[PDB]
From a paper:
La-related protein 1 (LARP1) has been uncovered as the mTORC1 RBP target that regulates the translation of TOP mRNAs through direct interaction. Among other target transcripts, LARP1 specifically binds TOP (terminal oligopyrimidine) mRNAs encoding all 80 ribosomal proteins in a TOR-dependent manner through its C-terminal region containing the DM15 module. To assess whether this uniquely repurposed fold is evolutionarily conserved, we crystallized and determined the structures of both fruit fly and zebrafish DM15 regions in the presence of a dinucleotide analog, m7GpppC, both to 2.3 Å resolution. Indeed, both orthologs adopt a structure similar to that of human DM15 with three tandem, helix-turn-helix repeats flanked by an additional short parallel N-terminal helix and an orthogonal C-terminal helix.
As in the human co-crystal structure, m7GpppC is bound near the C-terminus on the positively charged swath of both orthologs where the Watson-Crick faces of both the m7G and the +1C are recognized through specific hydrogen bonds. Interestingly, the human DM15 region shares 72% and 91% sequence identity with the fruit fly (Dm) and zebrafish (Dr) DM15 regions, respectively. Because the direct RNA-binding residues of human DM15 are 100% conserved in zebrafish DM15, we hypothesized that zebrafish DM15 would also bind 5’ TOP mRNAs. Though the sequence composition of the RPL30 5’ UTR varies across the three organisms, the unifying characteristics of the pyrimidine tract are conserved, suggesting it is a good model TOP RNA with which to probe the RNA-binding profiles of the DM15 regions from the different organisms. Both zebrafish DM15 and human DM15 bound this RNA with picomolar affinity. To ensure we were not simply observing promiscuous binding, we eliminated the 5’TOP motif by transversion, wherein pyrimidines were changed to their purine hydrogen-bonding partner, expecting that the DM15 regions would not bind it; indeed, that is what we observed. These data suggest that the zebrafish DM15 region directly binds the 5’ TOP motif. We utilized the difference contact network analysis (dCNA) to investigate residue-residue contact and residue community contact differences between human and zebrafish DM15. Residue-residue contact differences were found within the α4- α6 interface. The largest residue-residue contact difference was between 859-E899, within the α4-α6 interface; notably, residue 859 is a lysine in human DM15 and an arginine in zebrafish DM15. As compared to the human DM15 region, zebrafish DM15 displayed greater contact probability for multiple residues in the interface between alpha helices 4 and 6 (α4-α6).
Residue numbers in the entry: 796 to 945
């Protein structure tokens, strides 16, 4: 029924349906204001799921850009979506450039006094089969807090 749900089905993504849906969502974000469009929220959640299995760089960059913007104004649903995309998507297909972004946004989340991102990162490490991942020294320190909860 909802365009996000059509777009998420088996070979259900079409460009004209997505372009229409996106534009309305982004239009309603500007008209009503950040964090005040529920249709925009459906797009954060479409992106979180879609990009796990049909990654596209430009769509990823808008997702990350718009969710980081929302997060600084105080609306964290997009960032929560972003962090799930990182944690579940990098488990499907590891991409070292996306992994570096994941580290950058997690260290930012933690420096803001939040734990949602840091826990998704720890959870990625517990579930992932990727080997010889390079973890930033700063982030390695913050994760060191969860070893005590062992
Ligand atoms: C099996 N599992 C558990 N975790 C992570 O480990 C910690 C403890 O897990 P849980 O207690 O069960 O969730 P919890 O209640 O604590 O918080 P939560 O709200 O659930 O965040 C997670 C949210 O992912 C959404 N969602 C769900 C299903 C799906 N297909 N997509 C989703 O996107 C959904 O919305 C969900 O709620 C949490 O950090 C949790 O994320 C994992 N992480 C990775 N990479 N892979 C995993 O196979 C895995």
């Amino acid at each position: 029924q909802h365009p996000s749900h059509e777009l998420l089905k088996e070979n259900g993504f079409t460009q004209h349906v997505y372009h229409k849906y996106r534009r309305r969502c982004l239009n309603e974000r500007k008209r009503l204001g950040i964090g005040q469009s529920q249709e925009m929220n459906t797009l954060f959640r479409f992106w979180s799921f879609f990009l796990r299995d049909h990654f596209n760089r430009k769509m990823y960059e808008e997702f990350r850009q718009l969710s980081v913007e929302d997060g600084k104004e105080g609306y964290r649903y997009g960032l929560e979506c972003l962090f799930r995309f990182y944690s579940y998507g990098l488990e499907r297909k590891f991409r070292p450039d996306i992994f570096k972004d994941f580290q950058e946004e997690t260290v930012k989340d933690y420096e803001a006094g939040q734990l949602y991102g840091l826990e998704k990162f720890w959870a990625f490490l517990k579930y992932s089969k990727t080997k010889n991942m390079e973890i930033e020294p700063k982030l390695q320190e913050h994760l060191s807090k969860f070893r005590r909860l062992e």
